[PDB]
């Protein structure tokens, strides 16, 4: 019933997150080429969750799937300091798209389980989240390899959908 | 890195099939048998010791031919994960088949799960996903007749589908599939030309 996209640069952890939400396991993955789509249930709204590839050549296809999208989970590698400017560049592009005007944004600072990770604040800055309006959003520290963050982020997201 | 993941997909999918209601019936008995037999081998070889997926296509082909959308979806999703992770290459040609291989038969089975507008919408979606993966997979070599079939099926789903999400997906899938196929053709031409330039130098 509710359409959810998972977006972000390649390697960010989108697919791992996907199956961590669906069946609570760490799956071994390949770089996504064609989309993945799964039914996910967090108590208790029905979710159709889409997982597209973040390779450079696949990113232009993202907007082909923005139609009727209720919410976006945007996943960022907390250890990818070199490329965080690109996640911003892409996050900016997509939130300029008319088909996403009323979509809820949730950022996953992923791979938080690693010591080299940037902080929530530093990342929220570099992604220019404060300058966002009129946008409903929140950033969440996560590790998809472990369990940290997912439940808090989903609960927020779920409440935020209800509320709207 | 050598992976367990292949096995989980194969076995969990088979189990889900065997666990489904309408498969208990004698009406799906062949399917039931196929799945139990396949399982009996994969379990028997996984406690010992590579598992080769190519050998176990029969239960999925049969599941695809089922009259129960649930069975078909589960089958289609498993095939997409199999092809994607490169566990299901399909590089063995059946008898009358050549110049065609197991993979063309797999894509054809996928395409045949679409019977027109009346086809279940979740199965439709599953068909789009699996075809995209198949056609964009760098592992496998697909006959162009099979390519055109993949293409025709997505476009048919796009025309006939009542579900807008499915239509749009079909649309986006066609563009990517086509762009990939052409990119791949141009690159193959490049490699051939390069070899030929190299041979030119006796
Ligand atoms: N340490 C750590 N590694 C992670 C985490 N999440 C994912 N990874 C790893 O990072 C790599 C990328 O994982 P994926 O989920 O396939 O990344 P993706 O976002 O789907 O990337 P694309 O499919 O190419 O768009 C994999 O090797 C994962 O094992 C995490 O939370 N912590
Ligand atoms: Cl268009
Ligand atoms: Cl919003
Ligand atoms: Cl599929
Ligand atoms: Cl047809
Ligand atoms: Cl239907
Ligand atoms: Cl094209
Ligand atoms: Cl020669
Ligand atoms: Mg990265
Ligand atoms: Mg992936
Ligand atoms: Mg992915
Ligand atoms: Mg739910
Ligand atoms: Na589990
Ligand atoms: Na809808
Ligand atoms: Na880095
Ligand atoms: Na704007
Ligand atoms: Na409008
Ligand atoms: Na306003
Ligand atoms: Na919580
Ligand atoms: Na069993
Ligand atoms: Na069995
Ligand atoms: Na063996
Ligand atoms: Na399924
Ligand atoms: Na050829
Ligand atoms: Na749909």
Numbering used by the authors:
A (entry chain B): 17 to 180
B (entry chain A): 3 to 51, 74 to 226
From the paper:
The GTPase Arf1 is the major regulator of vesicle traffic at both the cis- and trans-Golgi. The trans-Golgi-specific targeting of BIG1 and BIG2 depends on the Arf-like GTPase Arl1. We find that Arl1 binds to the dimerization and cyclophilin binding (DCB) domain in BIG1 and report a crystal structure of human Arl1 bound to this domain.
As in previous studies, the mutation Q71L was used to ensure that the protein remained in the GTP-bound form. The DCB domain is comprised of eight antiparallel α helices arranged a twisted array where helices 1, 4, and 6 are packed against helices 2, 3, 5, and 7. The interface between Arl1GTP and DCBΔ51–71 has a total surface area of 1,509 Å2. Arl1GTP engages with the DCB domain mainly through switch 1 and switch 2, with some additional residues from the interswitch. DCB domain α helices 1 and 4 form most of the switch 1 interactions and α helices 6 and 8 interact mainly with switch 2. For the DCB interaction, the Arl1 hydrophobic pocket is locked by Gln200 from the DCB domain, which does not protrude deeply into the pocket, but its amide group is hydrogen bonded to the oxygen from the carbonyl of Ile49, and the phenyl group of Tyr77 is rotated by 70° (relative to that in the GRIP domain complex) so as to face the side chain of Gln200. In the crystal two Arl1-GTP/DCBΔ51–71 complexes related by two-fold crystallographic symmetry have an extensive interface (866.9 Å2) and suggest a dimer of heterodimers. The mutations Lys105Asp, Leu156Asp, and Gln200Glu that all had a strong effect on binding in vitro also caused both full-length BIG1 and BIG11–559 to relocalize to the cytoplasm.
